[PDB]
Structure 1
């Protein structure tokens, strides 16, 4: 139940020359540790993996956006969707509740509040 999560599989020798993907992250870590150690820094490192994480989530969705689909026009089942339903309930109360309040009584003598 969310999820499988595929903790063992096979290899040897499906594409054995796939190595030195660590050479990417060792290059970054040799770049980072040489950046992180210094006698006078007094401040953070930029680390633009955060910068590309906010700016591609905050902005750059509406310049991306085109309404070419109907799964972005799906929002009328989600935006105006439930707001239709809450109007249907609230006018059945305060009308069925209203007629009983006028024609006949329901509350007692000690109802000053309200």
Structure 2
């Protein structure tokens, strides 16, 4: 997704609220980096580190399936039309092609004379 102008450096102000906003971002950034620094720079470890953020990322798709979906609303029915719907779409495509083929075999032959495979 893209707008009329690409967002990279558009609309920026110093102010007072924005100055403290960058201070909030660096506070968590440095906190999570130092616990990595204490784990990386020692020979006593030998192994793969866990990281709680990455495990929760995999847990977002593998789990949290049935805890969700409790508000179905009209959004779930629209997804059903995009799933079960296209299965019924080809039913009026493959049958019409087969009825076109079956009529040709009995009357007015269309199949090639040099055909033997299957």
| C-alpha spacing 1:112/1:44, structure 2 compared with 1 (3 Å) | closer
Structure 1, unaligned runs of 5 or more: 1-16
Superposed CA RMSD in Å reads 1.8
CA positional deviation for 1:20: 4.2
The match for 1:88 is 92
| C-alpha spacing 1:113/1:44, structure 2 compared with 1 (3 Å) | closer
Runs of 4+ deviating beyond 6 Å: none
CA positional deviation for 1:39: 2.2
CA positional deviation for 1:107: 2.5
Q: Deviations over 1:41-73 (max 9, x none)?
A: 110111111111011221112212214311112
Q: Give the conservation status (yes or no) of the 8 Å contact 2:39–2:45.
A: no
**Matched residues in 2 for 1:33 and 1:86: separation?**
57
| C-alpha spacing 1:34/1:99, structure 2 compared with 1 (3 Å) | same
Bigger Cα displacement from structure 2, 68-77 vs 103-112: 103-112
**Matched residues in 2 for 1:26 and 1:66: separation?**
38
Q: TM-score, normalised by structure 1?
A: 0.74
Which is helix-richer, 1 or 2?
2
Bigger Cα displacement from structure 2, 18-27 vs 70-79: 18-27
Structure 2, unaligned runs of 5 or more: 1-20
Of structures 1 and 2, the one with the larger relative CO (CA 8 A, separation 6+) is 1
Q: Give the conservation status (yes or no) of the 8 Å contact 2:104–2:110.
A: yes
CA positional deviation for 1:77: 1.2
